[PDB]
Amino acid sequence: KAAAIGIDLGTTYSCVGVFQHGKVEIIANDQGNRTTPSYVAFTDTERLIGDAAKNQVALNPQNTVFDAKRLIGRKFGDPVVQSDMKHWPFQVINDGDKPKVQVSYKGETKAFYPEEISSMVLTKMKEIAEAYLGYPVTNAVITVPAYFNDSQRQATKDAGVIAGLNVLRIINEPTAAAIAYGLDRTGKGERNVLIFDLGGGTFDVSILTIDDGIFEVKATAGDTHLGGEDFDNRLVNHFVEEFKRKHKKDISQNKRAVRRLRTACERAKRTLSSSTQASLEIDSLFEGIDFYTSITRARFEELCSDLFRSTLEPVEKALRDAKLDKAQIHDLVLVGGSTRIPKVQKLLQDFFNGRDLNKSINPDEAVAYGAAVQAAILIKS
Numbered sequence: 024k025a026a027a028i029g030i031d032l033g034t035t036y037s038c039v040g041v042f043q044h045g046k047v048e049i050i051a052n053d054q055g056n057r058t059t060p061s062y063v064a065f066t067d068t069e070r071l072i073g074d075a076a077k078n079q080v081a082l083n084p085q086n087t088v089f090d091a092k093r094l095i096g097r098k099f100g101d102p103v104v105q106s107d108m109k110h111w112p113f114q115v116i117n118d119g120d121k122p123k124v125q126v127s128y129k130g131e132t133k134a135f136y137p138e139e140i141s142s143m144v145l146t147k148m149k150e151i152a153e154a155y156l157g158y159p160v161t162n163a164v165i166t167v168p169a170y171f172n173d174s175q176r177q178a179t180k181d182a183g184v185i186a187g188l189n190v191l192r193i194i195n196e197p198t199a200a201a202i203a204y205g206l207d208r209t210g211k212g213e214r215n216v217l218i219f220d221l222g223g224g225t226f227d228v229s230i231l232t233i234d235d236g237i238f239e240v241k242a243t244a245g246d247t248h249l250g251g252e253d254f255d256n257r258l259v260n261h262f263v264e265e266f267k268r269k270h271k272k273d274i275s276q277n278k279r280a281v282r283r284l285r286t287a288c289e290r291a292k293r294t295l296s297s298s299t300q301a302s303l304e305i306d307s308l309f310e311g312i313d314f315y316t317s318i319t320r321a322r323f324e325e326l327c328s329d330l331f332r333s334t335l336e337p338v339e340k341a342l343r344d345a346k347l348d349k350a351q352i353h354d355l356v357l358v359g360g361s362t363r364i365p366k367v368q369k370l371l372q373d374f375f376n377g378r379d380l381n382k383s384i385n386p387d388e389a390v391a392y393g394a395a396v397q398a399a400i401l402i403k404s
Contacts, residue, residue: 027162029394040395096175142185197229199393
């Protein structure tokens with residue numbers, strides 16, 4: 024009676040699931056949250072992981088590590104690492120072409136390999152599972168993007184090992200997503216599946232082929248820095264401009280006012296996925312002025328138009344690299360919280376000639392769900 028877990032070690036957040044009593048439970052942490060930010064903060068007195076780390080990122084930016092997934096398994100010299108560095112507030116150093124994150128922790132300067140940071144997020148996922156199950160957990164399946172190379176998969180494996188996990192297998196995120204939808208168990212036959220993964224920060228399009236239960240990646244396309252946060256920026260910039268046009272004051276130089284507006288915008292954006300309009304109500308936003316306004320879905324769609332239509336560019340590219348016509352795609356799977364946006368679903372559906380989208384599994388949890396299903400299948404031997 025020792026169940027294995029499935030972990031989606033995400034760029035911005037992580038999610039843990041377990042197949043137990045004939046179904047998957049996506050496990051909530053102590054706060055009741057089913058996702059955990061992939062953030063690790065170092066203070067002068069303690070190390071914080073998850074929401075406590077994200078909460079204070081703007082307070083202690085040099086010592087709050089996120090995006091470790093953008094560094095893991097890569098060499099310091101990699102053009103990807105060298106470009107990502109210019110926009111992170113934390114220091115990235117090297118130990119013979121191996122990148123490391125350098126921080127201040129308890130009055131000491133400490134350096135960590137990306138797998139050491141991710142092992143900290145993984146230890147949190149392990150504890151979360153253990154609190155739920157009521158017994159230790161050591162066996163796990165960890166997901167990775169389909170585009171990761173041997174070095175990136177090995178370093179993810181290393182992060183699991185440091186966390187005291189026995190990594191049963193490293194599997195592709197779109198593969199876990201298709202497994203969550205049971206697309207691997209259709210039976211005798213060849214099927215083409217397209218995974219449309221629009222996250223908080225990343226956009227990934229994967230085309231997989233499933234034949235007699237076996238998976239083959241045909242194409243990986245996407246945008247490494249497009250996501251939910253970009254739609255928030257559009258809403259923020261819009262309301263920074265609206266406040267200025269109404270009250271003739273620029274709020275953008277006040278950190279707290281920008282932060283409070285950004286929080287209200289992100290919630291307004293979520294409300295616009297189920298309603299046609301959202302209210303934005305901030306007391307004493309700037310110079311003591313209350314900001315009470317609204318935004319319609321149509322207005323939000325216009326502000327993000329480029330970002331919305333751009334999601335089809337990697338869909339079109341993926342079909343080309345896969346040497347497939349759009350009619351040859353049997354199944355469409357939505358992953359990532361931003362796929363709840365009606366226009367995102369409309370653009371993709373219209374493109375695939377009204378084809379139904381597999382969206383009944385929470386898009387933030389679908390990857391962990393498939394990994395948990397897979398972990399139970401591997402351990403069943």
